[PDB]
Amino acid sequence: MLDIVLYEPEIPQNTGNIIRLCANTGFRLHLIEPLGFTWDDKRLRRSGLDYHEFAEIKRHKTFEAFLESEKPKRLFALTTKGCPAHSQVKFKLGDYLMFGPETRGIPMSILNEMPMEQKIRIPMTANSRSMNLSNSVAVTVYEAWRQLGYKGAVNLPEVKLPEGGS
Template identity: 55%
Template sequence: MFHIVLFEPEIPPNTGNIMRLCANAGSALHLIEPLGFELDDRRLKRAGLDYRDTVNIRVYRDMREFIESVRPARLFACSTKGRNTYSNVRFCASDAFLFGPETRGLPLRMLENLPSERRLRIPMTAGSRSLNLSNAVAIVLFEAWRQCGFTGAIDHSGQEFKSDDTRPDHPP
């Protein structure tokens, strides 16, 4: 199971969309305080629809508590300041992806605590500042899940999804 980690998220609809995304991709959602909203915020509930009960959501006082509790095998920071393009990494199902607050991104000190190959970026055109947080999470999470053969997914008939991805970077 992938771990999506939102450090000090600020905008309830973004977190609600990510909640729904995590439910649909079988991923855990970890929220690092302080949050810019209450978990019972109607905007969060509206964006997350009825997926709140189907996703594993945990809230932590700080990053240290998250690391000590979850002990992720690998932690990747996703940032406009990242060095490594997300699509150049071979992901594992136990990986954790850290995203910063919508208005300021991850603090530089957090990025500097990770090896440069674990600081990911999503390419953008010149002059672009950043992507919407929920869109960025979707891009990275679905690339990681694709690489793992969409494990746990079902097809339109309710049967286990069989990936037809035959590219060399796709694990057997």
């Protein structure tokens, strides 16, 4: 389906979870270096993640690198400094969805260059605290996948007409 972009992820557990999520959903996952972990982190390795599976993930040396590399139709970012809820955007086929590190936001130097209508926020009640990154992406990805009718899912009720690709 769409492409998912993690910016300088710090906790390997979260990235593990997101790889699983992208596999089960058929979304392409991109990491933007540098990461707070390396394969030699047992935290990543001992999560039952396959070595080759992890190395398959498209890496980038910088955000610039990523940009020149992918030439994304529309780039999105999850930020508390954005305007629309994740469910309020209309996701279309070329879209890229980016997510900040666990402890710090995506740098303003990036966000500032971005339309306010492509900076998304997950709803929150009064005096909320921040939500786990992998939960954040799961919510976002499953919403995107919804708007795209869950194209590719095998465990849905029987559709009247018949339907491996991103």
